[PDB]
Design a protein around this nucleic acid. Structure first.
Lengths: 58, 79, 137, 94
RNA sequence: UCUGGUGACUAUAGCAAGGAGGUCACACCUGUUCCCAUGCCGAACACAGAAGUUAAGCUCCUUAGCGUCGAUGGUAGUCGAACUUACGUUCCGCUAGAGUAGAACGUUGCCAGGC
RNA sequence: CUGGGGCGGUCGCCUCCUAAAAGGUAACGGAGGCGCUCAAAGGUUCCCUCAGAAUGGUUGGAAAUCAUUCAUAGAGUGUAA
RNA sequence: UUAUUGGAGGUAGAGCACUGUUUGGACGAGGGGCCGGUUACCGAAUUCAGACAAACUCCGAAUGCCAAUUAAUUUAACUUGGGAGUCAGAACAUGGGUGAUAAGGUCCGUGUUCGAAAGGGAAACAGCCCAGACCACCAGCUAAGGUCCCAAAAUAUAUGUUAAGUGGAAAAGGAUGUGGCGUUGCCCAGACAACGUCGAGUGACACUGCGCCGAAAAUGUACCGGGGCUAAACAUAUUACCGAAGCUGUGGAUUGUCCUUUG
């Protein structure tokens, strides 16, 4: 259905390829959040950067 | 007093593939640079004096096997 | 001692030491053997030193196999000169052993004599060892 | 000679295999005549017991689920350090 | 359905062995007068015919002998993460090479003749 | 230029490894070549297929030359790789 | 940026089919012991088994790269013109050369931080770990790291290990130090030692956790930061709190984007 994604860890100290994914997800500052529709593409983007975010079934 | 007899190299030649499989090209676009024929010319593809492979028409690129252990490139028209 | 008659290149890069043993992990010629448990280079002076020690305790009774040969040359510079004006001259020949590689094999003696001779030989080597027998089952 | 088995369910991850081997259990597979491939597991000490009695080339009454299958041991991987069997193949013999 | 010509396909098509077939094909086969030709040889090439032969080439059936193909399961290596300075450990994805079971003594298009 | 400077070596071009399976990539890192040649060793049209191994055979330096079988380039390709 | 799909290429790893290196054992051909030949011995070939490679390859990943889609999220990219500064870089992690598998050494590839970055932790400590300061506040929640006193928060709940102040600086080796886990011997018909009694356990091996010795430097205790600790040490699990200029709450400043009440 829907997901809620929250940026729990900071992005400094991380490789740039992961920063680009965090920006493409739409998250900006630490603890900021978005709501998105579940897709295989969205799940791949979450999987790449999962040590930085938390997901809730919404 | 010791020295070495080795010090030299030649400039690198930028060989290898220049266009992608599935990409649309124009008339005389270079597809592959090489010494000898690691890849043969297929359909609508010529071979230059330095073994360079190039397109002869506009179309899309297709790399594909030739026999048991050989390769070729072709270009197909409509796109 | 042991060294190849000829090589294509006299100055080679040094081997990789991390990892586990690639092959030669079983006794195949004799009936007892010495298995390595840590990693090191063996320098072809240590091989001769350990072979002499092991072959005289057996009073020329049995047979010995050396499952190791030094194929790689290493270099070294003259006495402490400045850095970097070419690579140095050849000084020795080494073999690289990793945990699991059988080093020697004996046959034709009692298990007791074999244990003692291999123990004597293992004190001349820069690697921790372990007495093993020909596998079964 | 009679060994009993348990069927491994799908997709064991490497931690599962590691915990399995940290017990006395051994991953194995059974394939061949009159059977489809089945992934099983076997206890180590019982396997050593029955093999020390039937010999390297002998028949075993392996029990798989509800069936029992005459079988012979085709191959096995072995850790020379740690001295432990780590995988076995079983071959149905018709 | 058989044979032939001519194509497509990574030898699953190959090599080896055994056994059968011919006037419908094909080949061996007859000869060198002519077209033509052989560093010499009508061996090869080319031309002229149909006496013999299935012996061979070739076609059909048998075999897995060599070559080729080849899982599942496991292992090595490794992207990412977390511990750590250990010739390292733990978690999560991907996943070989070798080897084993096994497949395999080809599949198919167009045309002509024979059926 | 330079693991201070001097002394020694080097300075343009080609090929390979280092080079981390696209391309690129340093050190006074590891190995070699060039400063041409060919009137056919260029074009085209027809033919043809090796080294080597094996067994024989006057001369046989073992192998020169001849005959049969196997033989994937192991031959050959003006000149380094 | 990701999902899906297609493609180029020979690294890690493996392997020995080629080019080189190598250890055993056969087989035979040859020279050859002899009296031409036995046997020895010697060299070449074919074989069987087993190994090594930056400049070997019958094989061959993970990743990275090039592309295309009416795919999903996102906000850049390119062209032309005005104005620059830079061309001494450093440590850490990882793939490599050189050096001695030396250097806070030196030269390249790939990331991060410093440079040009305050705040919390690491005693102190550009480069390590957490985090990016618009300005008020005697509000709240968390990160790394922590909770006996210095000094904010557990002298907290369960299980176990250590006796060395190990914790709080090191090796080959040596050793009845003590837990855990298995396999297999001798068991009350009498071992296991002492000299018929002795009356129940007694061994080996394998595998592991934590400890001991090996362990000597120069101003003063002198690597736990100090006190001090037998847990306030170290495995496992639980769950409560403390903790930053991070996030939130309240007020304010500046600029922008939208709508537009120009708020």
């Amino acid at each position: 259905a829907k997901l809620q994604i929250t940026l729990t860890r900071s992005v400094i100290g991380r490789p740039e390829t992961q920063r680009k994914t965090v920006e493409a997800l739409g998250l900006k500052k630490t603890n900021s959040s978005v709501v998105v529709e579940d897709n295989p593409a969205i799940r791949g983007q979450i999987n790449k950067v999962k040590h930085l975010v938390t997901v809730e079934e919404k | 007093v010791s020295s070495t007899k080795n010090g030299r190299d030649s400039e690198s030649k930028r060989l290898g593939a220049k266009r992608a499989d599935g990409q649309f090209v124009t008339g005389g676009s270079i597809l592959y640079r090489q010494r000898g024929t690691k890849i043969y010319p297929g359909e609508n593809v010529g071979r230059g004096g330095d073994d360079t492979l190039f397109a002869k028409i506009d179309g899309v690129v297709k790399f594909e096997r030739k026999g048991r252990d050989k390769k070729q490139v072709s270009v197909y028209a409509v796109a | 001692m042991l060294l190849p008659k000829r090589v294509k290149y006299r100055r080679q890069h040094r081997p990789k030491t991390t990892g586990r043993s690639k092959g030669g992990n079983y006794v195949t010629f004799g009936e007892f053997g010495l298995q390595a448990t840590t990693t090191s280079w063996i320098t072809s002076r240590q091989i001769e030193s350990a072979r002499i020690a092991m072959t005289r305790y057996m009073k020329r009774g049995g047979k010995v196999w050396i499952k190791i040969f030094p194929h790689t040359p290493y270099t070294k510079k003259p006495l402490e000169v400045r850095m970097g004006a070419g690579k140095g001259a050849v000084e020795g020949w080494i073999a690289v052993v990793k945990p699991g590689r059988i080093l020697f094999e004996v046959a034709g003696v009692s298990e007791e004599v074999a244990r003692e001779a291999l123990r004597l030989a293992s004190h001349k080597l820069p690697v921790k060892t372990k007495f093993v027998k020909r596998e079964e089952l | 000679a009679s060994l009993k088995s348990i069927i491994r369910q799908g997709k064991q991850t490497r931690s599962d295999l590691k915990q399995l081997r940290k017990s006395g259990k051994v991953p194995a597979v059974v394939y061949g005549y009159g059977t489809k491939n089945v992934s099983v597991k076997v206890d180590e000490v019982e396997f050593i017991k029955v093999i020390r009695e039937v010999g390297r080339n002998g028949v075993i009454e392996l029990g798989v689920g509800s069936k029992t299958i005459k079988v012979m041991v085709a191959d096995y991987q072995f850790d020379p350090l740690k001295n432990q069997i780590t995988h076995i193949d079983f071959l149905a013999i018709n």
